[PDB]
Structure formats: structure tokens, C-alpha cells
Design a protein around this ligand. Structure first.
Ligand code: A1BI0
Length: 265
């Protein structure tokens, strides 16, 4: 819903993200929130504004809750649940020696649950990666920036060969045909699991995007992380089937995760 900035306070700078500056503040006093100022010239605003009303009705504990927007000025403000520990990618790296494999699997359950709710709403992420997941003050991980890439004007961020396209998270059918589906979000989730258990290493760090694309197309798969059991690896490996329909749904995936958690007791 629309928000009068009168009911907001700017308290701290959190840094510039993929879609503009973000600041910490309070909404209506009692809501810790993160306010993003959409970078001007980056988004198809009318399409994006109208779609924001659709994404507002998406609610889930493991989704960064959206509280409202300020759109009758530019730059647009986006008011979101405040995730105190910031991006999951950077949270993983700074606290590398503070994670037991039980906490890592938990982080995968958090994301998978959020992605299982998005699956059931027939809503695609299109850029699932650790850089788009956030962590709150209680160590819980939540997904964000889902569907945001549909309204990016830069063709580098959108085309399969664009210099900014997330090739290292993309399934073969996204690279060759641009066929986005929940199955492509599943491939991406597999890569995300590998990010988590790797404690934030760049997937295929030493491959050019092209080198990655062709190797992926011919069967290359990320190596088993050191902290991942062969059972955890089996789960993230199933996300990487060449055939999309051969990949398990987030529902089938979440169950497998819980089976592993139970066996880690
Ligand atoms: N909520 C936070 N809490 C703490 N930090 C946060 C955030 C955020 C944030 C802010 C807004 C959004 C959003 O609008 N999502 C959305 C909107 C829509 C709307 C169309 C309907 C649809 C789907 N997703 C998503 C993330 N960004 N940031 C830092 C930014 C700088 C880099 N960051 C770091 O941590 C590095 C310093 C280590 C994270």
C-alpha cells in the first residue's frame, strides 16, 4: 500500500544494491524497515509499479515482507522488512568459522520453503542466488528481489549473452532458449545450496560465462563442498538435471531436506 514518507524515518545508510541505495529506518514507529530508492533510469516504472501491487499480496515467513511503496515521487521508495544481518552471500563469508553443518542445512530449508510458496503461487524468481537472500537478527534466511529482473531496461541484465546475465546460476534451457520456469529456479536453488555449503565461494569462479555455459551444457557440475555430506550433495545435484522435468519440485525438495535434517539428529 502507499506510504506517506511522513510516517518513515531515515536512520542509517546500508549501501547501494543492485537496484539503488538502501537505508535503515522505522515505519510507523514499530516496524524496522529497509527503504530502497529505485535507481532512476533502471526500471520500466509503470509496468513495475503496477506489478508491485501484485507482489504485495505475496506473504510468507521466509519472504522478505513488503510493507508498501512511495510512488507519487521519484525515486520510488520500497519499504521492506529489515534483515539486520544483510545479504546471505556476505553473511556467509564473514562468519565462515561460526557455522555447523546443522545451521547450513537450516539455511537451505529457509530458502526452499520460501521458494515452495512462490512455486505454489506460480510466481518465478528468475535470479535466485545468495546475493538476493537476506538474513535477519535471528539468523533466519529469507528470499527477496523475486521477479525484479522482468522490468530491467539494461539488455545486458536480461539477454542470455549479456555481460550482466547470471549465467553461473542459469539452467541450460535458460541459456539457450530463455525458457524460465520453476524448474529453472530449482537449478538456481541447487547453485545456491552450493554457495551456502561453500561459505560464499563464487561458483565456477575461474570460468568465463561462456566457458561456464558450454561446460554446463556438456555435463560439468559444481564440486561437492567440503562441509556437505554426500546426502546434502545428492540434493543439490538433483537440481542440476539437464532435463528440467527431471528436476524435483521445491515441495519434493523440501521433504528431502527435512529427511536429511532428521538424520542429522
Ligand atoms: N531489507 C534489507 N535489510 C538489510 N539490508 C538490506 C535490505 C535490502 C533490500 C531492500 C529492498 C528490497 C526489495 O525491495 N525487494 C523486493 C521488492 C519487490 C517490489 C516491486 C514490489 C519485489 C520483490 N522483492 C530487497 C532488499 N538491501 N539491503 C542491503 C543493500 C546493500 C547491500 N546489502 C548488504 O548486506 C551488503 C553490506 C553487505 C544488503
Amino acid at each position: 500500500m502507499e506510504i506517506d514518507p511522513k510516517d518513515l524515518t531515515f536512520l542509517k545508510e546500508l549501501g547501494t544494491g543492485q537496484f539503488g541505495v538502501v537505508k535503515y529506518g522505522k515505519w510507523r514507529g514499530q516496524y524496522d524497515v529497509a527503504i530502497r530508492m529505485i535507481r532512476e533510469g533502471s526500471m520500466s516504472e509503470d509496468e513495475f509499479i503496477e506489478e508491485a501491487k501484485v507482489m504485495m499480496n505475496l506473504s510468507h515467513e521466509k519472504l522478505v515482507q513488503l510493507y508498501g511503496v512511495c510512488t507519487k515521487q521519484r525515486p520510488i521508495f520500497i519499504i521492506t522488512e529489515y534483515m539486520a544481518n544483510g545479504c546471505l552471500l556476505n553473511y556467509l563469508r564473514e562468519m565462515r568459522h561460526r557455522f555447523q553443518t546443522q545451521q547450513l542445512l537450516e539455511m537451505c530449508k529457509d530458502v526452499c520453503e520460501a521458494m515452495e510458496y512462490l512455486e505454489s503461487k506460480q510466481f518465478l524468481h528468475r535470479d535466485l542466488a545468495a546475493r538476493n537472500c537476506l538474513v535477519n537478527d535471528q539468523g533466519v534466511v529469507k528470499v527477496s528481489d523475486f521477479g525484479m529482473t522482468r522490468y530491467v531496461l539494461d539488455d545486458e541484465y536480461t539477454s542470455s549473452t549479456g555481460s550482466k546475465f547470471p549465467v553461473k546460476w542459469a539452467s541450460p534451457e535458460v541459456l539457450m532458449y530463455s525458457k524460465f520456469s520453476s524448474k529453472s529456479d530449482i537449478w538456481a536453488f541447487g547453485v545456491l545450496m552450493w554457495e551456502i555449503y561453500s561459505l560464499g565461494k563464487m561458483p565456477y569462479e575461474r570460468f568465463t560465462n561462456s566457458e561456464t555455459a558450454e561446460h554446463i551444457a556438456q555435463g560439468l557440475r559444481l564440486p561437492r563442498p567440503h562441509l556437505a555430506s554426500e546426502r546434502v550433495y545428492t540434493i543439490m545435484y538433483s537440481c542440476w538435471h539437464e532435463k528440467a522435468d527431471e528436476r524435483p519440485s521445491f515441495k519434493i525438495l523440501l521433504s528431502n531436506i527435512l529427511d536429511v535434517m532428521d538424520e542429522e539428529s
